[PDB]
């Protein structure tokens, strides 16, 4: 009864006290010695056209040459970033798509949306005819993200406060994760594909375990919804972009929030975040029709990319860190370098 709830409230006090004793010094004090990066200016090398409606997702390829995009008219076009030549245009069973992916081996493409069903397509096949391989359909509520650990496993995050690890061969849920009190909106796999995070709608991000299957940590420093997340290249930290203008950086080992990024003249939201190759620049989208470039250690704006005409809803950085691609709702993709 109340005693059980009293123990729950009592334990929450121990967590806060433990975190306080571990804060010897702030990150800003140490990072003050380094020199600023300076102004960063890049121009759109290429522009990709052909979509009819807004783009909601985008994922690069393993070779950092081919990328796949998803739109609201039911199309899944694979591009060639070097010469701007479409390779495929797969029609979809429904016009509502909110996610997309690309296999590490390049032989599969995933998709999903408001149909509660995650589909898998085959690219390299006999006679060159793309067809649906499997249709995983065990969920309730819309999906938000899809990822591939390999050619045989896919992780999805549905909108009913749950996440699951699927299996293409059998089409069944190997394991499921619970504990969120709100909708799950994003996830990002670790570089070693052993752990992953998830930004829920209750201003809380966790650190799940793929094999064991139970939560490990929980960070709740935000004040509004969470729309994006991304791991540091090191693999021991991640950056979170929330509904309010603030974007915060957390750390797994210490368990606490390190630094916050915000500006007085920005009151819009954040839809996508990502890092650079060496983890020095923290790019982030915005609702004011452009993109801003932050600094991981200095927390100051160092460039604005404003070549768009509508909100930015996706973003990605190549494996070799040679280009940055940003989509939008005006049916236009762009490549910056």
């Amino acid at each position: 009864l109340d005693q059980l709830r009293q123990e729950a409230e009592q334990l929450k006090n121990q967590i806060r006290d433990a975190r306080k004793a571990c804060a010897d010094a702030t990150l800003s004090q140490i990072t003050n010695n380094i020199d600023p990066v300076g102004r960063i200016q890049m121009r759109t090398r290429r522009t990709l056209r052909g979509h009819l409606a807004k783009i909601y997702a985008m994922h690069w390829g393993t070779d950092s040459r081919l990328l796949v995009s998803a739109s609201q008219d039911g199309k899944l076009i694979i591009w060639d970033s070097y010469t701007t030549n479409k390779v495929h245009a797969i029609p979809l069973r429904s016009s509502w798509v909110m996610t997309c992916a690309y296999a590490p081996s390049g032989n599969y493409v995933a998709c999903g949306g408001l149909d509660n069903i995650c589909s898998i397509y085959n690219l390299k096949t006999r006679e060159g005819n793309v067809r649906v391989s499997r249709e995983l359909a065990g969920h309730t509520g819309y999906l938000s993200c899809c990822r591939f650990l390999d050619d045989n496993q896919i992780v999805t995050s549905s909108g009913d406060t749950t996440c699951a690890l699927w299996d293409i061969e059998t089409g069944q849920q190997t394991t499921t994760f619970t504990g969120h009190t709100g909708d799950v909106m994003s996830l990002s796999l670790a570089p070693d594909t052993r752990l992953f995070v998830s930004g829920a709608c209750d201003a809380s991000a966790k650190l799940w375990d793929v094999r064991e299957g139970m939560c490990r940590q929980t960070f709740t420093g935000h004040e509004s919804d969470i729309n994006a997340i991304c791991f540091f290249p090191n693999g021991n930290a991640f950056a979170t972009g929330s509904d309010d203008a603030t974007c915060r950086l957390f750390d797994l080992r210490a368990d606490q929030e390190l630094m916050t990024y915000s500006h007085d003249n920005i009151i819009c939201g954040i839809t996508s975040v990502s890092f650079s190759k060496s983890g020095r620049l923290l790019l982030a989208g915005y609702d004011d029709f452009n993109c801003n470039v932050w600094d991981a250690l200095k927390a100051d704006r160092a460039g604005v990319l404003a070549g768009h005409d509508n909100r930015v809803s996706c973003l990605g950085v190549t494996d070799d860190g040679m280009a940055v691609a940003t989509g939008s709702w005006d049916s236009f993709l762009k490549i910056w370098n």
Binding site: L52, I77, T83, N85, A89
Partner: peptide, 23 residues
Amino acid sequence: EEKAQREANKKIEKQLQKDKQVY
């Protein structure tokens, strides 16, 4: 190799224009 890629791009562009009318 480049000629085939251009031909593939042309085929897709034909279908997109046709489907733009219906939407």
